[PDB]
């Protein structure tokens, strides 16, 4: 028999299946002998200690900055003072160097939140002795000369001596649950074009500059022995906290500066000498 | 990878860690590495094909610093913004990858003329763009698709885009992501180990095309390298929130 | 772990690592990088014949060349670097018994350990970082800063305290084996004898007091913790 098929349905024709997503379903056609075969990971597989998310990368300790601390630095003097924003390093100049892994991964996202961790490693010995106070300051910032204003915030006085390292969690205290990134979401300028106000006027977003600072001031002036160095260097590391969070994938803030060469056809393009 | 918690010997009191803000705005969590690399990246933006050549070669490698534009050098058919994608920045940290990729081709046509796609397995060379293979002046008799390699076909009128999933055909455990120099003439068997093959795209007549790429479902990166030395100038091309 | 009061022989609470027929003591504590796995399972496929180990030869501590840290070295300066196993064969400690199996066999898989011993005085101060980069061939001039060094597997050496570091290096290569020796009759298509790179960098410059010493020294030691060799051949001189 040849009976008529009466069953039907209304379909909405789309070109691609789940084009913009990073999960779910897909209409992909495997270029294999077997249509449902996959790459075996029986022997060769991802090692357990490799970062599975970007939040694992943002928990790697990177060296942010350095500064000096001499015997000549009178009490209350700002040794270190930066705007602690993971979005951008500077607002007023071109940056070049080695950005920390938590800053590198942050630059991929439009929003961040949660605490940030610091770690101050004093490149010293047993015979160095001083005291610094590390303060986190929100919304309103202190004057350079008024140390008292810095003391009336969230502080951790570190007594340097035998121990040469102090950890400091910066508590996340802002008006919004997530801050937005100060770096632009999309920037088509690639040829270092000379910028004007008409260019600025037609930007992608408005840079909401962070006023949150972390200052390090002298409490007890560094009094080393005669036989050792009068000035030490301090290394300031930085990673995202245990509750660090990112959202909204954008065009990356940072890009490779050193040793970038575009690919060519090998060996058509005069590889044979 | 190394956390660096090794060096965290401090055991003194600290401020609270609070509560995670994950899943607060929406459940859609975008933090996973295997979700970012599974997002499609654009490669060739309205590049031209020819029937006069063997076809258009697309070397099967993930998008990274290899496919980056530097200012004031030779012009390529690759789009300039491959360098600065989130999907590239991830591949700049991992030097090994393994598993299938997913190329998406979009022909700018609605004709009955069929376009073909051909996965050539890892054969050692790393060519891209249009090529006259063996310098012949006629390929219509002996086409690259007709030789008898795995081959799908687009028919623009029915649907002017396909999504293929090219297998990890190689003798290596891992395909290498990047080099310190792409244009350097070093030992020839090692230069080949940064691709796992090629896509070729032959048309009947001349036509334009766009190519995207991403990681397949079966895809793992490894051999973490940390972040590179970088430059930025985003500050410069935007107004402050204070005029 | 805990120091005691001073006896005739000072603060006698030293530990020691005894590996085969070589012992290395240590005064202060030891920093150790995480013990992480290597590629396994391909071994039985890639080599049809059985693979051999020579623990007595290869698992003994071998000192290589001394490193000279000065007060003139800036941050991100390479103090030394080692392409391995190439440099342990033909560049440093050329007549070591650790190299004997590399003469005869053509392939292998190598998990290493590297102990560093520094001796700067108590009136000095400085930080040196040592880090491994797995499969670095034609990737030495990128991701090669102190910043990338802190991300990859690494140890950290304070030059005042004189702590010791031990960097464990798994075999993480794009191929199954690494070729040991280049030869006139062998292929030039592949780069042999380099599966990794070890960088020793100044994280913070050395500093000294008035009329102090303007330098101090570090000494690396290596040992293979799992050296498997495959493909026996006629014995040749190393490079």
């Amino acid at each position: 028999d040849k009976p008529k098929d009466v069953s039907s349905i209304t379909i909405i024709p789309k070109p691609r299946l789940g084009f913009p997503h990073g999960k779910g379903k897909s209409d992909a056609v495997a270029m294999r002998v077997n249509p449902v075969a996959l790459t075996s990971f029986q022997d060769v597989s991802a090692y357990p200690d490799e970062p599975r998310t970007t939040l694992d990368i943002a928990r790697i300790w990177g060296l942010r900055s350095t500064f000096n601390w001499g015997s000549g630095d009178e009490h209350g003097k700002e040794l270190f003072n930066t705007v602690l924003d993971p979005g951008l390093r500077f607002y007023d100049q071109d940056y070049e160097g080695q950005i920390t892994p938590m800053e590198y991964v942050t630059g991929l996202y439009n929003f961040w939140s949660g605490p940030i961790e610091l770690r101050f490693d004093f490149v010293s010995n047993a015979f160095h002795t001083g005291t610094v106070i590390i303060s986190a300051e929100y919304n309103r910032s202190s004057t350079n000369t008024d140390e008292c204003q810095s003391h009336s915030t969230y502080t951790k006085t570190f007594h340097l001596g035998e121990q040469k390292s102090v950890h400091f969690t910066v508590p996340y205290i802002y008006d919004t649950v997530v801050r937005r990134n100060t770096a632009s979401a999309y920037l088509p300028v690639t040829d270092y074009d000379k910028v004007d106000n008409v260019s600025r006027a037609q930007a992608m977003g408005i840079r909401a500059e962070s006023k949150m600072r972390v200052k390090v001031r002298v409490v007890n002036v560094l009094r080393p022995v005669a036989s050792t160095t009068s000035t030490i260097e301090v290394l300031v590391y930085m990673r995202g906290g245990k509750n660090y969070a990112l959202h909204g994938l954008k065009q990356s803030t940072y890009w490779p500066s050193n040793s970038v060469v575009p690919i060519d056809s090998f060996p058509p393009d005069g590889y044979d000498p | 990878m190394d956390t660096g918690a090794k060096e965290d010997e401090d055991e003194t009191a600290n401020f609270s860690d609070g509560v995670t803000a994950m899943g607060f705005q929406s459940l859609d969590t975008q933090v996973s590495i295997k979700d970012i690399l599974r997002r499609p990246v654009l490669l060739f933006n309205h590049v031209e094909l020819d029937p006069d050549y063997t076809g258009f070669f697309i070397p099967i490698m993930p998008p990274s610093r290899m496919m980056q534009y530097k200012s004031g050098d030779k012009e390529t058919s690759f789009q300039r913004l491959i360098g600065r994608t989130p999907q590239a920045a991830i591949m700049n940290l991992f030097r090994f990858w393994r598993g299938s990729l997913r190329y998406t081709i979009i022909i700018h046509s609605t004709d009955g003329h069929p376009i073909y796609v051909t996965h050539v397995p890892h054969t050692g060379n790393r060519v891209y763009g249009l090529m006259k293979v063996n310098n012949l002046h006629e390929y219509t008799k002996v086409p690259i698709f007709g030789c008898g390699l795995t081959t799908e076909m687009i028919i623009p009128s029915v649907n002017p885009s396909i999504c293929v999933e090219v297998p990890f055909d190689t003798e290596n455990n891992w395909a290498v992501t990047f080099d310190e120099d792409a244009q350097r003439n070093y030992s020839w068997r090692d230069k080949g180990d940064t691709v796992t093959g090629h896509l070729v795209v032959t048309p009947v007549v001349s036509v334009y095309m766009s190519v995207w790429v991403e990681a397949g479902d079966d895809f793992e990166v490894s051999n973490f390298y940390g972040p590179p030395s970088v430059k930025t100038n985003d500050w410069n091309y935007a107004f402050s929130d204070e005029h | 772990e805990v120091p005691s009061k001073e006896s005739i022989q000072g603060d006698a609470t030293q530990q020691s690592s005894k590996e085969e027929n070589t012992i290395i003591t240590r005064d202060q504590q030891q920093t150790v990088s995480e013990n992480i796995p290597s590629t396994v399972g391909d071994l039985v496929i890639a080599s049809s014949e059985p693979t051999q180990q020579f623990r007595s030869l290869t698992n003994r501590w071998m000192p290589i060349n001394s490193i000279r840290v000065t007060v003139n070295g800036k941050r991100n300066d390479l103090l030394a670097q080692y392409y391995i196993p190439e440099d342990f064969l033909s560049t440093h400690a050329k007549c070591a018994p650790n190299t004997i199996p590399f003469e005869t066999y053509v392939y292998g898989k190598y998990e290493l350990e590297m102990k560093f011993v520094a001796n700067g005085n108590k009136f000095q101060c400085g930080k040196v970082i040592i880090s491994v980069k797995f499969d670095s061939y034609q990737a030495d001039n990128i991701n090669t800063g102190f910043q990338a060094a802190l991300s990859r597997p690494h140890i950290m050496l304070d030059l005042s305290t004189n702590n010791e570091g031990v960097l464990k290096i798994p075999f993480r290569y794009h191929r199954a084996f690494v070729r040991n020796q280049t030869h006139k009759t062998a292929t030039a298509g592949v780069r042999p004898g380099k599966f990794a790179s070890i960088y020793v960098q100044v994280l913070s410059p050395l500093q000294t007091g008035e009329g102090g010493a303007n330098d101090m020294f570090i000494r690396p030691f290596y040992r293979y913790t799992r050296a498997e060799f495959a493909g026996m051949s006629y014995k040749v001189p190393l490079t």
């Binding site: - | 350097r184 070093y186 | 300066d77 392409y83 440099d87 030495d140 090669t144």
Partner: peptide, 26 residues
Amino acid sequence: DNPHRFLPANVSNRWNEYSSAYLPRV
């Protein structure tokens, strides 16, 4: 010609990459 093709002799080894002896490359 293209300068990237071959590295200068003084900085490089036989295999046409930066020598391990040459520390100044950074």
